[PDB]
Amino acid sequence: TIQLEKLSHPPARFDSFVYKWQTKAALARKVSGPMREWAAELKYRTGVHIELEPTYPERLSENATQWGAYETADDVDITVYLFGSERGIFNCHKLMEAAIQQDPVYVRLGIFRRLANSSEVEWLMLRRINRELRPPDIPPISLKLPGKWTLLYERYKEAAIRTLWEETGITVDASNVYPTGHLYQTVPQYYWRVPVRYFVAEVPSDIRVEGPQVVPLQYMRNWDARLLRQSPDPIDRAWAQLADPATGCAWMKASMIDQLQK
């Protein structure tokens, strides 16, 4: 249950009808998302614009009650504002109640191939170029397994399979896709962070990879291999060596990644 409070006007910091939801990050992150994955979907569905802020931001600068550090990100007090029509807000409210009962997450579908000469498998990876307006925990370029996030009402595996296709053009069958758990590592200051659900699936080693089918320009592609292999960054050089500039994808071993980080 979400209790909304109607406001007469927005506060000055937010320069339509306005409602407020006073809650915790444990719930607020489900209607927002680090990159507004869910906020944008809510806007798409209802026209309602969502804004979030920590209610007591000074507490986020504390290391050590009722006025010191928060124990966990989940405990962070969050004030959510909704701007829209009465009808949009009515509809958006309904969607949020459903969302906080779902568990919207990031998904990663680890596509892997087996090499004859090796017991360690190779993982398909991409490098996503991130926007200039991004939370501080996200680097300029994310090296990642394929996969994005669950849409509202979407099941985990369904989302993994759909977003694998969006990033790589690869179609896998659900019966070959295996969930393998989740990771969720965060701190109170990064209260927006969400769990990541993992899956694995084997593909044949000679499978044809097309690359991103959706927003392809948000991924590294068509770099200058000669130039990039002169980068001071070990990942850049491994990327120039192993990635296909036409697809923005590389087959990589975790052990090789570990050796680069030393």
Numbering used by the authors: 77 to 90, 94, 96 to 144, 156 to 353
From the paper:
The 5′ ends are processed by a pyrophosphohydrolase complex termed the PPsome, which is composed of the so-called mitochondrial edited mRNA stability factors 1–3 (MERS1–MERS3). The MERS1 structure reveals that it is comprised of two α−β domains.
Apo MERS1 crystals were grown and the structure was solved using the MERS1–GDP structure (after removing the GDP molecule) as a search model in molecular replacement (MR). There is, however, a notable difference between the two structures at the base of C-domain near the GDP binding pocket. Specifically, in the apo structure density was absent for the region encompassing residues 354–380. In fact, the RNA is deeply embedded in MERS1, raising the question of how it gains entry into this binding site. The binding and stabilization of the single-stranded RNA may thus occur concomitant with the folding of MERS1 residues 354–380.
